[PDB]
Amino acid sequence: VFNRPILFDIVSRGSTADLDGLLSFLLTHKKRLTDEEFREPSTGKTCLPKALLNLSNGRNDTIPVLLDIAERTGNMREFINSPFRDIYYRGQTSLHIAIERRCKHYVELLVAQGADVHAQARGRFFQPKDEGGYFYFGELPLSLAACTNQPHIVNYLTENPHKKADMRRQDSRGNTVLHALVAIADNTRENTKFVTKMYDLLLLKCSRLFPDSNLETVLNNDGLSPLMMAAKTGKIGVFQHIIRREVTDEDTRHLSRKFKDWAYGPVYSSLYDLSSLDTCGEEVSVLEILVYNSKIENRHEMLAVEPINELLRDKWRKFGAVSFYINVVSYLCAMVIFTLTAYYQPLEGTPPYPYRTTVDYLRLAGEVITLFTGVLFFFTSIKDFQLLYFIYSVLVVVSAALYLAGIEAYLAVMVFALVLGWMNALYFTRGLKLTGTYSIMIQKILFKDLFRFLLVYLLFMIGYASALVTLLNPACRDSETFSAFLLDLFKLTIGMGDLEMLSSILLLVTYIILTFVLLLNMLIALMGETVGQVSKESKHIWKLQWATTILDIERSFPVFLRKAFRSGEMVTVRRWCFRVDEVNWS
Amino acid sequence: KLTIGMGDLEMLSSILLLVTYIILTFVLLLNMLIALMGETVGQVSKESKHIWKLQWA
Amino acid sequence: IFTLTAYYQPLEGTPPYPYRTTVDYLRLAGEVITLFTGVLFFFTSIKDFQLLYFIYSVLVVVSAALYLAGIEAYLAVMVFALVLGWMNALYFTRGLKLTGTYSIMIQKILF
Amino acid sequence: TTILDIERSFPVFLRKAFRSGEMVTVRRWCFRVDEVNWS
């Protein structure tokens, strides 16, 4: 009125007599209901938002009568939609608010009046929880009705006698209702159940409306696809149902992911449809995302879903074992050849081309094999953990270059290459003999032990040294200042004992006692932490390393060569199916 | 053998990658013993109070 | 800085005021920093686990007093201050790198 | 312990405090927390 706040209070309180008098003088002053007077200077909130936020147990049946003011004001189109301007709320519309409050009557009234169901609420508060926002639902009224556990209004909005927001419509993020529904999907039981139920309903409805292309196919700007998005973001709750989706209606057969081909009583040959878990290098697949990504929080249980686990096992038995054994054996033999070439490295130095003997010819063959494997490894690395492999490749290349120069005193790089490669040997052997605790061990204690040791060791060493050189301007030395003899003395103490000093001062013994006890109890704590962490690797870590090895091998050799998983039918049941056999007596 | 069991190792040198070799082998053997202890205690679990019964039978 | 000052502690003993060199000036700056931190720690302790911190502060103060006396054979208190302070170093590092098992270890087996 | 020791260490008259809030009926130095529940 004279000031907006009293109008806002009146609309919040739901008064009508004063309110239709307000309408009266608004008619008198020819002022549009969307004027700056009715919108905040900062937020620009209209009457409708404030009225709906004050929803009193669904008793806002009157404020539509207020909205009836609009056509009298002559500005109806812009009035319904409310394009907010706050960075904290950008684009939020009255329809979003009405649907949010979990009441369908006002949603029906607004949409029937012509509410713009295609609303892109690109507000910071609407962005995912990890992008500074608080709630992401797909930035669409239909996706907002969906994500918020609101079946009836998603049905109605898709079945209203007026403009009905097509499920296909993609927001700015490109998500669509399915992607949004998996975005807020939680791994908890209630969220998982409601999300999966509504997800089924939604996909079935879209299929019935659009048999030409099921909504699963349509991707986002990222391009993941709903299943791959539930995979990349650790959404086991949806994922585990996405894999095993089988429905009833005949018109909805294609939109299933687990057929049942034949049964013989207590044996069921369930035919999973992994039409997107292995693209043969064509596009991204759930296996690549699931295994070659660490942001997942539920990797181990997400590798336990039936088709993925059985498919890893099949790729292992069929081709993984042979290729892995060939690779590891070839690596070991080639590097043993390298090691023997180093052992038989031409004596007397100066190897310009010292090979005039049969054993010399064998040595030259071994060196050629070493260079070939090194250059091939460099090619793989550049085409492609990889850190150490590339270090080995470059070291081999440099050693070969220096050797071909016929210069001396530069075999050191060759020895470095040897030692780095054999250190990679344990990385490769991880997959053999069902091993791999060693890799966990190397990535567990390595840094902590060196950190603490180096620090306290050198530290008490210098503390010792100050007083020692205080005593002597003899025993630890003959002359001059060198902490090196004191370092040697401390090594003698820690590993050897029988320590000698010029003194024959007690704080020195205190230093020794403290460092010794600290290192011993450090080893004890490392043992305890390691045993706690591993817990026999929970029987899962090795499985993840195994999957890593299998997929690495599969990607290694070209896939145009016909090494693929099972195949299947042509139409109505050309889906590259995979089989699984399970017996149940229920 | 002197290095692993005895220490007080001597060389012609008086080259660092040698010390790296020594450190890596020593740490590997120690943590190998640790892992063997852990796996043994996990496996036995006081032989689950059954293995000895099978040997007895 | 304290530890390096001890390592570079003026040779031949008798440090009345032996700083006529650039490296000597750097050593004097390090010793001044040591005394400043020691006296500040004493101020915090008197204003204020605290046991060892106060021991370090008093040891630094006594070492500074003896050094300013220009007398010899009394750097021992300085070395005591150094070792006690670095023992407090683990107490302070408890909060860094999500550590702290070491403090539990020291208060578990020691006695 | 470390956090509170640090906070007490430097003077508090320097304006390093927790969240703030309203004036009356809701001058209580409130603090906020965000939690999502699907019940």
Q: Give the whole-angstrom CA distance, residue A419 versus residue A428.
A: 14
What percentage of chain D's residues is helix, strand, coil (to nearest 5)? 20, 0, 80
- Which of D34, D36, D38 lies nearest to residue A149, judging by beta carbons? D38
Count residue pairs from A and C with Cβ separation < 8 A. Answer: 54
Q: Give the whole-angstrom CA distance, residue A285 versus residue A280.
A: 9
Residue A122: C-alpha distances to residues A53, A89, A92, A310 (Å): 20, 8, 8, 42
Q: Give the whole-angstrom CA distance, residue A78 versus residue C73.
A: 91
C34: how many CB neighbours lie within 10 A of its CB?
23
Residue A260 structure tokens: 């049942």
Is A240 annotated in a binding site? The answer is: no
Q: Give the whole-angstrom CA distance, residue A176 versus residue A202.
A: 11
Q: Give the whole-angstrom CA distance, residue C49 versus residue C106.
A: 13
Contact assignment for A530 to B34 by CB distance below 8 Å: yes
Q: Which residue has the tokens 């023997």?
A: A340
Q: Which residues are bridge partners to A90 per DSSP? A: A85
Closest CA to A241 of A254, A217, A257, A265: A257
Give yes or no for a contact between A143 and A177, defined as CB atoms under 8 angstroms apart. Answer: yes
Chain C: give the shortest CA distance to residue A521, in Å: 7
Torsional sign, CA C27, C30, C36, C42:
negative
Give yes or no for a contact between A107 and A63, defined as CB atoms under 8 angstroms apart. Answer: no
Contact assignment for A415 to B17 by CB distance below 8 Å: yes
| Ramachandran quadrant class, A581 (left: phi over 0; alpha: psi -120 to 50; beta: rest) | beta
Topology of the domain covering A4-272: 1.25.40
Return all residues near A363 (Cβ < 8 A) that are at least 6 apart: A341, A344, A346, A355
Chain C: give the shortest CA distance to residue D14, in Å: 18
Give yes or no for a contact between A335 and A408, defined as CB atoms under 8 angstroms apart. Answer: no
Torsional sign, CA A391, A393, A396, A401:
negative
Q: Which residue has the tokens 């496996």?
A: B43
Residue A95 structure tokens: 């329809």
Contact assignment for A441 to B38 by CB distance below 8 Å: no
Give yes or no for a contact between A229 and A284, defined as CB atoms under 8 angstroms apart. Answer: no
Q: Give the whole-angstrom CA distance, residue A384 versus residue A390.
A: 10
The total number of residues written for chain C in this structure? 111
Q: Which residue has the tokens 């021991």?
A: C55
Give yes or no for a contact between A48 and A7, defined as CB atoms under 8 angstroms apart. Answer: no
Measured in angstroms, the resolution is 4.0
DSSP string over A97-110: HHHHTT-HHHHHHH
Q: Give the whole-angstrom CA distance, residue A515 versus residue A260.
A: 67
For residue C2, give the chain A residue with the closest CA: A463
Q: Are strands A267-272 and A258-263 parallel, antiparallel or unpaired?
A: antiparallel
What distance, in Å, lies between the first and last C-alpha atoms of chain C? 32
Read off the amino acid at residue C107: Q
Distance of CA C10 to the CA centre of its chain: 17
Residue C41 structure tokens: 């720690």
Q: Give the whole-angstrom CA distance, residue A176 versus residue A142.
A: 9
Reduced to 3 states (helix: H, G, I; strand: E, B; else coil), residue A253 is: coil
Strands in A267-272's sheet, in edge-to-edge order, are: A258-263, A267-272, A578-583
For residue D34, give the chain A residue with the closest CA: A134
Q: Which residues of A touch B17 (CB under 8 A)?
A: 412, 415-416, 419
C47 touches D: beta carbon within 8 Å? no
Q: Give the whole-angstrom CA distance, residue A272 versus residue A565.
A: 12
Q: Give the whole-angstrom CA distance, residue A502 versus residue A465.
A: 12
Q: Give the whole-angstrom CA distance, residue A453 versus residue A487.
A: 13
Read off the amino acid at residue D9: S
- Which of D34, D36, D38 lies nearest to residue A190, judging by beta carbons? D38
Return all residues near C80 (Cβ < 8 A) that are at least 6 apart: A507, C59
| Ramachandran quadrant class, C25 (left: phi over 0; alpha: psi -120 to 50; beta: rest) | alpha
Give yes or no for a contact between A217 and A260, defined as CB atoms under 8 angstroms apart. Answer: no
Residue A404: C-alpha distances to residues A294, A350, A362, A368 (Å): 43, 11, 18, 12
Q: Which residues of A touch C77 (CB under 8 A)?
A: none
Q: Give the whole-angstrom CA distance, residue A564 versus residue A576.
A: 10
Is B42 annotated in a binding site? The answer is: no
φ/ψ of residue A42, rounded to 5: -100, -55
Q: Which residues are bridge partners to A581 per DSSP? A: A269
Residue A385: C-alpha distances to residues A315, A388, D12 (Å): 23, 6, 49
DSSP string over A133-161: -S--S-SSHHHHHHHTT-HHHHHHHTT-S
Q: Which residue has the tokens 């040897």?
A: A418
DSSP letter, residue A384: -
Chain D: give the shortest CA distance to residue A188, in Å: 10
A137: how many CB neighbours lie within 10 A of its CB?
25
Give yes or no for a contact between A398 and A406, defined as CB atoms under 8 angstroms apart. Answer: no
Q: Give the whole-angstrom CA distance, residue C68 versus residue C39.
A: 15
Reduced to 3 states (helix: H, G, I; strand: E, B; else coil), residue A260 is: strand
Q: Which technique was the structure solved with, according to the deposited record?
A: cryo-EM
φ/ψ of residue A200, rounded to 5: -55, -65
Q: Give the whole-angstrom CA distance, residue A103 versus residue A504.
A: 91
B38 touches A: beta carbon within 8 Å? yes
DSSP letter, residue A81: S
Q: Give the whole-angstrom CA distance, residue A10 versus residue A72.
A: 20
